[PDB]
């Protein structure tokens, strides 16, 4: 609808809406042709439709060509200075399509404005729409137009027949934010079934990571969807679907050392995993530092030959 | 449906603007890797 | 099959008012701008107006200027095209026009007409 | 605004000869977004190419043209008694003056 509307506000008046509560589907928007440039700063358009926004803003403008290029973070002119500045730190897309048959008409279009003058700069996503005639001279006019003080808005007068540098261009910015909050808009990716007590990859509403999911005592306000531990990584998750709270745990690693005697007498080794359970890893024994693989386990005691760990020690016999 | 033809005609006709008239674009790629080397510059040699 | 059914005109005296109806039966009216043409007994043809697909913006010819109003009624299938002050050389028979569109992601319309209903002759005397 | 400028003013060949048309705008470009419309004297105008280089479905493959910048030709690839009628060029705010392509005799 955004995409599809009539009418584009003017610059000066930019229309900002809000979009939640819904599955969005960028790979439509990316692959038209319709639009000309497609934009995305601190994400990847191809990548749009695996990701989970907690909320969507879509401003809708219609500019000149030659001006463009001004809706990007860090740039100056007149619109980047005095009519929509976008945040340093942004992160969205930009699209603009040509409009030269929705809005330029015969005798130029009166309606679209855009603010020339201003007393100071924008600060990002503030809109201005006061009209009070500026002070260009040091001559205070009190309202009054005429020699050093103009009225800031000035009209655009689209002509069709005007060169593409001056022609009409929508533009929509598409404002994503990525924090701490349950999100709402999220892309058209089918959920799988759930699976416990297995090291498996989990995307849970668009938080990735790999681990086991294992049921949990933790008692979840229910305001909150996700829990950290004491060092800030997620150790626990709501489900989005039958709000279940789950544990996650890193799935068992550790350090593997070889313990050999000398390949000068023999190149039998001991394969030695350190604080792993080796009921875990797919004669045998087990001990405090891990569990020991390849080695013998005697009743008898001697000097110690190859350090362990623990009180353990393994020598060649 | 929504099926189309994958290729496209330039038609570069004579009279167009700089953005449309045809260029002939040639793209030279090096290879340096670990090899003897087959082309090099018109530097002269010089008594070992 | 696709037409356009116009209704209306006839002898108006000279700065009389009239309206003239557009009705289209075959396609999907809402989706598509319109224009109107006029064309001069023996002579060539006219731009005159141009409607959205709701009808929020009118781009009314000089010659029409501030006399002719284009109405679009989505709602009950039909282009409306009334004036006032209407002017002896405006003797014309008028064409209901239909503007092309990809109806793609962006309706992207292309100033290239499809379909031309049959005209409806108009006439201003004393 | 734009005028369009029709040549030649009028044409006239055999039932069997191809023709050729030219239409002119004033100035500058419009993105070669131009329409060619036939219009039998007692019937409405008829599209039969648009965008100047492709025609529309059902128009017959004889009527082919192309331009770009300040003219635009239609070339006709042979003739029938078709001909009969007013072409006229139509951009974005004007319509040409038309050409009558005649019959021979």
């Known amino acids: 609808e955004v995409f599809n509307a009539t009418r584009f506000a003017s610059v000066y008046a930019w229309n900002r809406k809000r979009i939640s509560n819904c599955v969005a589907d960028y790979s439509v928007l990316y692959n038209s042709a319709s639009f000309s440039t497609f934009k995305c700063y601190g994400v990847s358009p191809t990548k749009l439709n695996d990701l989970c926004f907690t909320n969507v803003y879509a401003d809708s403008f219609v500019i000149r060509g030659d001006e463009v290029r001004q809706i990007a973070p860090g740039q100056t002119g007149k619109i980047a200075d005095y009519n929509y500045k976008l945040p340093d730190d942004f992160t969205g897309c930009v699209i603009a399509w040509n409009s030269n048959n929705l809005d330029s008409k015969v005798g130029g279009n009166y309606n679209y404005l855009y603010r020339l003058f201003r007393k100071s700069n924008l600060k990002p996503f503030e809109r201005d729409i006061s009209t009070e005639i500026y002070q260009a001279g040091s001559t205070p006019c009190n309202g009054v137009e005429g020699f050093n003080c103009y009225f800031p808005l000035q009209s655009y007068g689209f002509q069709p027949t005007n060169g593409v540098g001056y022609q009409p261009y929508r533009v929509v910015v598409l404002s994503f934010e990525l924090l701490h909050a349950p999100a709402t808009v999220c892309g058209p990716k089918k959920s799988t079934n759930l699976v416990k007590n297995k090291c498996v990859n989990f995307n849970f509403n668009g938080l990735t990571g790999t681990g086991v999911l294992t049921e949990s005592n933790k008692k979840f306000l229910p305001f909150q969807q996700f829990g950290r531990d004491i060092a800030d990584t997620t150790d626990a998750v709501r489900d989005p679907q039958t709000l279940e709270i789950l544990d996650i745990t890193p799935c068992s690693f550790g350090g593997v050392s070889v313990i050999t005697p000398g390949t000068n007498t023999s190149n039998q080794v001991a394969v030695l995993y350190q604080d792993v359970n080796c009921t875990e890893v797919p004669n045998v024994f087990q001990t405090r530092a891990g569990c020991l693989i390849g080695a013998e386990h005697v009743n008898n005691s001697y000097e110690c030959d190859i350090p362990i760990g623990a009180g353990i020690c393994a020598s060649y016999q | 449906f929504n099926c189309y033809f994958p290729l496209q005609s330039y038609g570069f006709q004579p009279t167009n603007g700089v953005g449309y008239q045809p260029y002939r674009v040639v793209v030279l790629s090096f290879e340096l890797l670990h090899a003897p080397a087959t082309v090099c510059g018109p530097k002269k040699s010089t008594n070992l | 099959e696709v037409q356009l059914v116009e209704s209306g005109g006839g002898l108006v005296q000279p700065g009389g008012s009239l309206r003239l109806s557009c009705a289209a039966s075959?396609?999907?009216?809402?989706?598509?701008?319109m224009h109107w043409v006029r064309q001069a007994p023996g002579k060539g043809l006219v731009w005159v107006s141009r409607?959205?697909?709701?009808?929020?913006?009118?781009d009314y010819a000089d010659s029409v200027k501030g006399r002719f109003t284009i109405s679009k009624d989505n709602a009950k299938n039909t282009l409306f095209l009334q004036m006032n002050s209407l002017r002896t050389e405006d003797t014309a028979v008028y064409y209901c026009?239909?503007?092309?569109?990809?109806?793609?992601?962006?309706?992207?319309?292309?100033?290239?007409?499809?379909?031309w209903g049959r005209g409806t002759l108009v006439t201003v005397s004393s | 605004e734009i005028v369009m400028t029709q040549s030649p003013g009028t044409l006239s060949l055999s039932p069997g000869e191809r023709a050729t048309l030219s239409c002119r705008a004033s100035?500058?470009?419009?993105?070669?977004?131009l329409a060619w419309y036939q219009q039998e004297p007692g019937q409405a105008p008829r599209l039969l190419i648009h965008?100047?280089?492709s025609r529309a479905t059902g128009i017959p493959d004889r009527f082919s043209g192309s331009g770009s910048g300040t003219d635009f030709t239609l070339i006709i690839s042979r003739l029938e008694p078709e001909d009969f009628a007013v072409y006229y060029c139509?951009?974005?705010?004007?319509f040409g003056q038309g050409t009558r392509l005649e019959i021979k005799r």
């Open positions: 026009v239909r503007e092309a569109t990809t109806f793609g992601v962006i309706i992207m319309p292309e100033w290239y007409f499809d379909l």
């Open positions: 409607v959205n697909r709701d009808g929020s913006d009118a």
């Open positions: 139509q951009l974005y705010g004007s």
């Open positions: 075959g396609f999907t009216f809402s989706g598509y701008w």
């Open positions: 100035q500058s470009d419009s993105s070669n977004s």
């Open positions: 965008d100047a280089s």
